[PDB]
RNA sequence: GCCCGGAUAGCUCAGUCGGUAGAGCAGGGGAUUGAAAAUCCCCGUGUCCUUGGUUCGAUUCCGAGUCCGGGCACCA
RNA sequence: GCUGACUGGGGCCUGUAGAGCACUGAUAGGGCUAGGGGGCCCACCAGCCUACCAAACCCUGUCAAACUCCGAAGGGUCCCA
RNA sequence: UCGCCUCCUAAAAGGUAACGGAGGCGCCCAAAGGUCCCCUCAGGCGGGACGGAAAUCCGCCGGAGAGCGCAAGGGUAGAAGGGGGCCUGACUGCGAGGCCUGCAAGCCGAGCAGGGGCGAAAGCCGGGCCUAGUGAACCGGUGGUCCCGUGUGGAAGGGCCA
RNA sequence: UCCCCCGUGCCCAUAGCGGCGUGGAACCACCCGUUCCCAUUCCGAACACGGAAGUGAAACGCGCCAGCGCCGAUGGUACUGGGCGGGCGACCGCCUGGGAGAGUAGGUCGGUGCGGGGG
């Protein structure tokens, strides 16, 4: 029973896959430390009370409130608005 | 001093002419030097270890400025050198110490080229501004036989204000350049 | 090359990493010490 | 055989028909259009085929507009093997067609010349075919 | 070009921009975030003597005596393209440090 | 990882028991020859790897950084 | 102990379907045309022509999982019912 | 073929398999790090002695196609790019709070104290434009050290920090 | 409240390119200098200081223009939430909600906040 020979592939690979995205929205309050951006670059700038760590990693500087913001060529910038 | 024969002679003489041959309103219009950039190339010095800081020292008794020292943007295995620690030798006139570089130039310089007819008329093109390069660079009074080892000619762009290169003509012809008619 | 740091004439280790064949030799600098706050380190 | 020069990547997935042609559904150059009314992955072979056999028709006569080309790979397997160890060789090319492409067109040729050497092709080609003309084809102001 | 834009680094309150003209020297204390200007001093625009750093020291003077007023202590200190030299505003007044 | 051995002319290598730098061979000219070798003559090559130091000086003595050469271990 | 699924209204988030050629490549016909091949033809190096290979540019036509100037339906999420 | 990173497949949150398509990693930088101050690309068309078709020089045109050590993607000149000055925060003691998530890992982190660096200052600095350059425990080795020390004092040998 | 300029934000090209006219009393620039502060891998070019003869040429501000760029409906299609049909298959079709992209008409040579100086 005459079996045919076959290959191999140099392919089969891809990398863990790294969960990116933005991670609270507008109108979610949120207590300061909270990250609300996970990103490979300045995708989003960051905006009133949010910091960005070596990562490009958005986050809350106070306890607020999310806004969002596109100004065009200027890009999109996240906001804590707070509350208090 | 604050006044050179040229830079006299460019106020009292060349200026008015060219009001007159182009009719210029404003004062400013009126075409006038910008600078003169003067730049030398060297693609030895590089090698044979040559240190070559000869051309400088000596580029500064002509020009009277210590000139500054130029280096490679891009790698050229072809052409040897490796960007940075590279070579090349450029230094910028203006004011006065333009005018005591192109007065002697003209006046006493280039009267010593081994042949000449006049400076070839074809080296602004439009593009305001002119270019020339010269060969030995003992065509200067400050420069002696005695102190020269090798031959290192030069490039010599001239900017004006003059936007087409016929008022330009008119200008640099005027100050006493030779064209070859 | 591994590489450690310490408050010279003393204690303390701080370890980092040099290039050896780059521009390497006697790697010294000044960081803090625990040990009594803070000094030049040499490496080792 | 009719292919591209280059191509990005070698190999490339099979994909659908969604309905329509997107594009290059009206007339544009020659006088006669060979009009597709079914999808399809057209072969080069086959369009190359069809061509000739236009050509020797109305033999060295006007002129022919080839609109379909032989971008995707047509992968196969060797014969005989089984399942797995990576995607197939690349064995042609097709293009991709889909009702309402003009696929051919001619100029410088009697109706007569015309609707027949188009027929014809339209045997070569695996799939069902329809002439036209140049109606109501100018999109223009 | 002055892009320069140093002033983009203005994270935490209270710009005081200066504009330097070849005759004159003037300064407003600006709240971003409001777009308002609240306190702004100038040069011979404010009606003083004819001359040009020693001008900016009387100028400055002047601006802050007027904030102080308002209760504005503390600032930031701009002028974009300052290459911050010469026709300094060391003023004694605000709490802007420096 | 720890103990050995080494570095000297273009190449392979001798040695004051601290005071001289040399074979051999390759290399270049000259004699021989029907020749090419082997012969026989003359002439070049020295940071004695490295800074320190002992001493009246150092090339061999000692500290030493350095590069190769082994040698015996070890490896959670 | 009413907070659930699901639903209504508001607000963010998105890059597929479709489409498009602005980027990355592929591509038909025509024009113009750097180089190169080759005929005219000579070393005084120019010069003219080419129903040949061929950049960019122009006109007209297209294609794409790893293209996107563009982009739905839907989907995810927080608030209030 | 076996771990890790990029892209697609992946059906516009996340996640998503196959001996599906196609590439990278097992390093590197004492400046390629901190801060302050400056500077702006690739091309294209002229023009210029040696000078190619980019050596260096001049002038226009050129928002980004340059560059950012290295694969890809994202990002980016209103710098993350280039150049210079002082520097060592490539800190020690801590960490509100979150991302991710079966576990254990992985990741971001404001702010407080110590003692610093650059800045007039506002401020910034707990390595590097970002996402690879990695290996739990066990068993040992070094250097430290408030600790334990088999009747007592010390040793031997342990623990603790690195 | 109304002009004009000087600062400084917001909207994010309907703000732009390119053309064409204007403006110097005031602002602003270019300008006059390079002693002094401060500067240049060489240059007072740039940065900086002391000025005020001259110009609005350059740059900046204000007007007009649609050639290029930018924006862009309506209608109709594509695609599709959900409901259901035909074909052997590639795929096609009807319902009810949503509804592009290209393209046609058309529009655009900006709008606005605060503060200052001048009628």
């Known amino acids: 029973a005459h079996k045919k020979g076959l290959g191999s592939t140099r392919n089969g690979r891809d990398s863990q896959a790294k969960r990116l995205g933005v991670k609270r929205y507008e109108g979610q309050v949120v207590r300061a430390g909270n990250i609300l951006v996970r990103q490979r670059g300045t995708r989003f700038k960051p905006g009133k009370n949010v910091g960005m760590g070596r990562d490009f990693t958005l986050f809350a500087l106070v306890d607020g409130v999310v806004e969002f913001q596109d100004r065009g060529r200027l890009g999109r910038y996240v906001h804590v608005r707070p509350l208090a | 001093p604050l006044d050179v024969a040229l830079k006299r002679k460019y106020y009292e003489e060349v200026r008015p002419e060219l009001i007159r041959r182009f009719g210029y309103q404003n004062v400013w219009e009126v075409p006038r030097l910008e600078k003169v950039v003067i730049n030398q190339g060297l693609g030895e010095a590089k090698e044979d270890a040559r240190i070559l800081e000869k051309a400088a020292q000596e580029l500064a008794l002509i020009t009277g400025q210590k000139p500054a020292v130029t280096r490679a943007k891009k790698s050229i295995s072809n052409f040897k050198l490796r960007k940075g620690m590279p070579i090349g030798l450029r230094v910028t006139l203006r004011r006065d110490r333009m005018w005591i570089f192109l007065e002697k130039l003209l006046n006493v310089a280039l009267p010593r080229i081994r042949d000449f007819r006049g400076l070839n008329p074809n080296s602004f093109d439009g593009r305001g501004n002119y270019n020339l390069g010269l060969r030995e660079q003992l065509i200067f009074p400050e420069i002696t036989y005695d102190m020269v080892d090798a031959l290192r000619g030069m490039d010599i762009a001239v900017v004006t204000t003059a936007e087409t290169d016929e008022e330009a003509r008119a200008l640099l012809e005027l100050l006493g350049f030779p064209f070859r008619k | 090359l591994l590489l450690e740091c310490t408050e010279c004439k003393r204690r303390n280790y701080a370890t980092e990493k040099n290039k050896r064949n780059t521009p390497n030799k006697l790697e010294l600098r000044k960081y803090c010490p625990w040990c009594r706050k803070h000094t030049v380190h040499r490496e080792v | 055989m009719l292919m591209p020069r280059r191509m990005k990547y070698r190999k490339q997935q099979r994909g659908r028909l969604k309905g329509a042609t997107k ?81 051919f067109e001619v100029a410088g040729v009697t109706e007569e010349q015309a609707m027949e050497a188009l027929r014809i092709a339209g045997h070569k080609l695996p799939i069902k075919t329809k002439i036209v003309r140049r109606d109501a084809y100018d999109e223009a102001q | ?55 900016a020291r009387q100028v400055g003077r002047a601006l802050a005596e007027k904030a102080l007023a308002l209760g504005i202590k503390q600032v930031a200190f701009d002028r974009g393209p300052y290459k911050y030299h010469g026709r300094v505003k060391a003023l004694a007044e605000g709490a802007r440090e420096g």
């Open chain 4, 23 to 103: 594009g290059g559904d009206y007339v544009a150059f020659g006088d006669y259009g060979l009009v597709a009314l079914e999808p399809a992955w057209i072969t080069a072979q086959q369009i190359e085929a069809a061509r000739v056999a236009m050509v020797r028709h109305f033999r060295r006569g006007g002129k022919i507009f080839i609109r379909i080309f032989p971008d995707k790979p047509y992968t196969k397997k060797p014969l005989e093997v089984r399942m797995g160890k990576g995607k197939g060789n690349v064995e042609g090319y097709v293009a991709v067609v889909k009702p309402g492409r003009v696929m």
């Open chain 5, 1 to 55: 070009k002055f892009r320069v834009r140093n002033r983009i680094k203005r994270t935490g309150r209270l710009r005081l921009s200066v504009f330097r003209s070849l005759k004159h020297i003037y300064a407003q204390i600006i709240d971003d975030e409001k777009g308002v200007t609240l306190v702004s001093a100038s040069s011979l625009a404010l009606k003083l003597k004819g001359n040009k750093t020693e001008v």
